[PDB]
């Protein structure tokens, strides 16, 4: 754990399948975090099996790829979804 201090926020770059789902084009990680939150409790995509898991939806599974997983997972599965917003190099790839 690592706030930042006096600077621009830590702000990630939500993926382009993200980015949509929840609409956050950019935001920082205790403001995704939530945003995907409110998902899995809107969405109620809390595991019927467990109560710690949450079961990714269509899109999720196609997002996170885990048909079950913890909730504790969730953070660490996010850092892939977030990206750096920023350059490095020309040319891609």
Known sequence: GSSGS???PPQFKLDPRLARLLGIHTQ????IIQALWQYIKTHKLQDPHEREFV???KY???IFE???MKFSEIPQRLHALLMPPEPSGPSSG
């Open 28 to 31: 920082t990680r205790p403001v």
């Open 66 to 68: 885990s048909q079950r």
């Open 6 to 8: 006096s600077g621009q």
């Open 55 to 57: 079961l990714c939806d």
């Open 60 to 62: 999720l599974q196609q």
